[PDB]
Amino acid sequence: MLNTTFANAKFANPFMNASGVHCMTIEDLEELKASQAGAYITKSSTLEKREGNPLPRYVDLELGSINSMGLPNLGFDYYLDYVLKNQKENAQEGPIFFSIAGMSAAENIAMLKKIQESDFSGITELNLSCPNVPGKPQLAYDFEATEKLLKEVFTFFTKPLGVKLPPYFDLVHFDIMAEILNQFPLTYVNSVNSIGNGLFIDPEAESVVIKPKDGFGGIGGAYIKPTALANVRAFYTRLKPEIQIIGTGGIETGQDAFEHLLCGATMLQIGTALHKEGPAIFDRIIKELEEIMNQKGYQSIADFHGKLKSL
Amino acid sequence: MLNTTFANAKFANPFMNASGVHCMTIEDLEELKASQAGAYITKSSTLEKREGNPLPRYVDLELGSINSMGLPNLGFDYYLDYVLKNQKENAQEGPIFFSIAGMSAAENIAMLKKIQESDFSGITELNLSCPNVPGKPQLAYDFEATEKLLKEVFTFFTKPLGVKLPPYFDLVHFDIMAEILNQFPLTYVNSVNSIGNGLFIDPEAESVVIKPKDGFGGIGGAYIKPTALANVRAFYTRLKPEIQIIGTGGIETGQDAFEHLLCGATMLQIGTALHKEGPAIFDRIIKELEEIMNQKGYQSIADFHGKLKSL
Ligand SMILES: Cc1cc2nc3c(=O)[nH]c(=O)nc-3n(C[C@H](O)[C@H](O)[C@H](O)COP(=O)(O)O)c2cc1C
Ligand SMILES: Cc1cc2nc3c(=O)[nH]c(=O)nc-3n(C[C@H](O)[C@H](O)[C@H](O)COP(=O)(O)O)c2cc1C
């Protein structure tokens, strides 16, 4: 009963992995294809293969996780060849999502041109918010640079495109972003990427727990649900209906999923919890969401989607 | 063993209430004076009395709190007369802190002029980040507006002044702010105010939990510690040594306090936990911190202050 329509495609359920979790190699991707995830997305890629930051760069926290991966990925070509080959063996219902995170505007345009010129018929996600790349600030916090990039992208990109955004914390920022985004034929916006540059400390050792950037890393998990929900909701009420929303952040139980959908998310991505549990999480959370719906007498997501009530 | 020197004043310990919690009326303040807090601060005031937002506007959460108080306060004159009367009857070792949060630059300058002209010899905290006032974006997220205001304030304000800042999530933002602040004879910066505009949902009722701003409110408590610690540490390494730091955010145990001190905070403010526990919290947390220090063989905060180790 979780059938979903997103970007003109039908998915068995709205669950996907969040980019960067369990999607580094073809082996990881095949495991997601074999799981009950309704769809899956590749690790954000760059033109050149990258090793990422020094270890340790990821730590499981009681309330979530902190990481500073530094974009380790097997390179743009590796992922493109994989998706193109999978396009031929139609053994999946729905398109695959392809994430790109170029280190500069030039690199993102180059990758998008290649995607546009290829036979790829899936969905592309432009990551404008990686908080863990030393020397590179989050492009999506610079409204002007963001508007400039999107203008150049839409002069040639005609395929489905969505943007992964960092969290915003001021209503006026939502107004400004929504206005910039509403002018483009975007397929979706995905909120949110990690809460950037947080710090976790081991009081006994009196030190940080991750090696890169003096311990500052992206925060995810339970810590960020309040912000994730707010971002999904704030955008749901300001974006033109043509642009759908993928909600990412703090999803660990069917209840968390239910809350994102109530705010207005259509697809849902699980990061930290999937990293901790493995692909079996999809089976568990699908069962949990269905139980919630059963108890409430709901037979489809359309019964409550975007219907969060004010007081 | 928690003796502290801050703004050239000596305090029995570094603990104080965070502005807005247990400090609305003279009765609240007197209870703080009678508790074991090393110092205390008043509720942010405006020139005129304010009722604040409709109820419910504050909700305790398992991992913190969410609120949209709307600056309810008894007015600038009420707090000033109270602090002035207290100065006469010298029954306190250490100045009292006075928070102001005018709805416009003009209102802030007017209150500051009044403080400058009065006999007030305590410390003033200028709130540049109230995220719960409908229609007003956080001034501190506007670097240019913030620089202008401080430029004007320092052309006449000669008494001790500190600034309460909203959390920042991009290292470049820390660089820009540190450069703006370093040019002024500021006494301190207080990081951080609530994580702005989060959302909490009651899944059973399928609605938000607070009435104002459609349920969007400031987040505090365990949810924000990683961000709080990061802000304190990021500023500690960029600000000129003359500007000290007050760390606020997610403090509820001695260990949380220890982590803030390890990052570089000198004074510590407790918000959410004090709202939940009452002034008796000071007695508990002081014992917990001393217990940690005893186990490690530390006899004063100077032994580990700002000594967080990188990997
Ligand atoms: C180990 C790790 C790596 C990540 N890598 C990326 C990445 O390559 N691309 C991206 O857009 N987001 C990345 N994310 C961030 C997320 O996709 C997601 O937005 C985030 O973790 C918030 O969700 P969560 O609370 O479920 O973790 C990563 C998160 C983690 C935990
Ligand atoms: C009920 C409430 C009212 C608040 N009022 C103010 C206020 O008037 N001025 C201010 O600077 N901060 C205000 N804050 C924010 C805090 O002083 C503090 O920055 C925040 O709660 C983060 O700390 P915590 O994690 O200990 O709550 C308020 C917080 C709460 C819980």
Catalytic residues of B: 130
Kindly state the greatest CA–CA separation across chain B: 55
- CA A59, A65, A68, A69: dihedral to nearest 10 degrees? 80
User: How far is Cα B194 from Cα B201, in angstroms, rounded to an integer?
Assistant: 18
- Name the DSSP letter for residue A250: S
* Residue contact B226–A199, C-beta within 8 A: yes
User: How far is Cα A125 from Cα A136, in angstroms, rounded to an integer?
Assistant: 19
Secondary structure of residue B198 in the 3-state scheme:
strand
What the block records as the tokens of A252 is 């660990």
CATH classification of the domain holding A101: 3.20.20.70
Ligand 1 pocket test: pick from A15, A19, A285 the residue with the most ligand atoms within 8 Å of its Cβ: A19
B208 with B247, same domain: the answer is no
CA of A57 to the centre of ligand 1 (A): 13
**What are φ and ψ of residue B64, in 5° steps?**
160, -125
User: How far is Cα A208 from Cα A199, in angstroms, rounded to an integer?
Assistant: 7
The residue range of the domain holding A265 is 1-52+71-194+221-311
Helical (H) or strand (E) element with A156 = none
Which chain B residues touch A59 with a CB distance below 8 Å?
Answer: none
CATH classification of the domain holding B204: 2.30.26.10
What the block records as the tokens of A197 is 């540059």
Q: B119 CB contacts (<8 Å, ≥6 apart)?
A: B84, B87
B136 with B105, same domain: the answer is yes
What the block records as the tokens of B226 is 């990683």
Helical (H) or strand (E) element with B196 = strand B195-199
B218 reaches A (C-beta below 8 A): no
Distance of CA A207 to the CA centre of its chain: 30
Number of domains in chain B: 2
CA-based Rg of chain A, rounded to a whole angstrom?
18
Secondary structure of residue A223 in the 3-state scheme:
helix
Q: Which of A130, A161, A222, A246 is catalytic?
A: A130
Which chain A residues touch B234 with a CB distance below 8 Å?
Answer: 197, 216
Q: Which resolution in angstroms does this entry have?
A: 2.0
B5 carries a ligand binding annotation: no
Which chain B residues touch A198 with a CB distance below 8 Å?
Answer: 226-227, 229-230
Q: Give me the DSSP letters along A32-95.
A: HHHSS-S--BPPPB-SS-B--SPSP-EEEETTEEEE-----BS-HHHHHHHHHHHHHS--SSSP
Q: B260 CB contacts (<8 Å, ≥6 apart)?
A: B228, B229, B232, B247, B249, B251, B268
What the block records as the tokens of A269 is 């991505």
A234 reaches B (C-beta below 8 A): yes
A164 with A151, same domain: the answer is yes
Q: What is the Cβ-side half-sphere exposure of residue A112, based on CA atoms within 13 angstroms? A: 26
B171 with B227, same domain: the answer is yes
Method: X-ray
Which among A111, A196, A114, A105 is positioned nearest to A146, based on CA atoms?
A105
What the block records as the tokens of B41 is 């601060």
**What are φ and ψ of residue B29, in 5° steps?**
-55, -40
Token pair 């802190």 is found at B97
What the block records as the tokens of A213 is 């950037």
- Name the DSSP letter for residue B43: P
A114 with A135, same domain: the answer is yes
CA distance A12 to chain B (A): 24
Q: Where are the beta strands (DSSP E) in A153-310?
A: 161-165, 188-191, 195-198, 201-202, 207-208, 217-220, 244-248, 267-270
**Which amino acid residue places its CA nearest to atom 26 of ligand 1?**
A271
* Residue contact A169–B206, C-beta within 8 A: no
Give the A:B interface size as CB pairs under 8 Å: 157
B34 with B19, same domain: the answer is yes
CA of B221 to the centre of ligand 2 (A): 10
- Other CB atoms within 10 Å distance of the CB of residue A160: 21
- Other CB atoms within 10 Å distance of the CB of residue A186: 21
B46 with B126, same domain: the answer is yes
Secondary structure of residue B303 in the 3-state scheme:
helix
Residue type, B233: R
Which among B223, B262, B169, B286 is positioned nearest to A202, based on CA atoms?
B262
Length of chain A: 311
Which among B117, B119, B122 is positioned nearest to B93, based on CA atoms?
B122
- Name the DSSP letter for residue A155: T
* Residue contact B207–A310, C-beta within 8 A: yes
What the block records as the tokens of A253 is 């139980």
Secondary structure of residue B236 in the 3-state scheme:
helix
B12 with B126, same domain: the answer is yes
User: How far is Cα A42 from Cα A28, in angstroms, rounded to an integer?
Assistant: 9
CA of B75 to the centre of ligand 2 (A): 18
A252 reaches B (C-beta below 8 A): no
DSSP bridge partners of A190: A164, A246
Determine whether A130 is an active site residue. yes
Query: Helix H segments across chain B?
Result: 26-34, 76-88, 105-117, 143-153, 171-182, 225-236, 254-263, 272-277, 280-296
Can you give the three-state secondary structure of A167-211, one letter per residue? Answer: CCCCHHHHHHHHHHHCCCCCCEEEECCCEEEECCEECCCCEECCC
Secondary structure of residue B28 in the 3-state scheme:
helix
> Taking a C-beta distance cutoff of 8 angstroms, is the pair B187, B123 a contact?
yes
A308 with A205, same domain: the answer is no
Which among A18, A32, A61 is positioned nearest to A265, based on CA atoms?
A18
Which ligand has its closest atom nearest to the C-alpha of A252? 1
B183 reaches A (C-beta below 8 A): no
User: How far is Cα A119 from Cα A124, in angstroms, rounded to an integer?
Assistant: 13
Q: Establish whether the linkage from the previous residue to A56 is cis, with ω within 30° of 0.
A: yes
Which ligand has its closest atom nearest to the C-alpha of B229? 2
What the block records as the tokens of A264 is 């207005």
- Per DSSP bridges, beta strands B216-220 and B64-67 are antiparallel
Domain termination site, one of B184, B203, B220: B220
B29 with B14, same domain: the answer is yes
User: How far is Cα A176 from Cα A290, in angstroms, rounded to an integer?
Assistant: 37
> Taking a C-beta distance cutoff of 8 angstroms, is the pair A253, A276 a contact?
no
User: How far is Cα A234 from Cα B215, in angstroms, rounded to an integer?
Assistant: 11
C-to-N gaps above 2.5 Å in chain B, after residues: none
Q: Which atom of ligand 2 is nearest to the CA of B67?
A: 1
Length of chain B: 311
Q: What is the Cβ-side half-sphere exposure of residue B208, based on CA atoms within 13 angstroms? A: 28
Secondary structure of residue A114 in the 3-state scheme:
helix
User: How far is Cα B54 from Cα B97, in angstroms, rounded to an integer?
Assistant: 28
> Taking a C-beta distance cutoff of 8 angstroms, is the pair A132, A166 a contact?
no
A134 with A2, same domain: the answer is yes
What the block records as the tokens of A206 is 């009196």
Cβ-nearest to B229 among A201, A262, A307: A201
B208 carries a ligand binding annotation: no
- CA B270, A192, A225, A257: dihedral to nearest 10 degrees? 180
- Per DSSP bridges, beta strands A64-67 and A217-220 are antiparallel
**What are φ and ψ of residue A222, in 5° steps?**
-55, -35
User: How far is Cα A234 from Cα B216, in angstroms, rounded to an integer?
Assistant: 9
B202 with B90, same domain: the answer is no
Handedness of CA B180, B182, B184, B189 (dihedral sign): positive
Burial of A136 (C-beta count, 10 Å sphere; 0-12/13-18/19+): middle
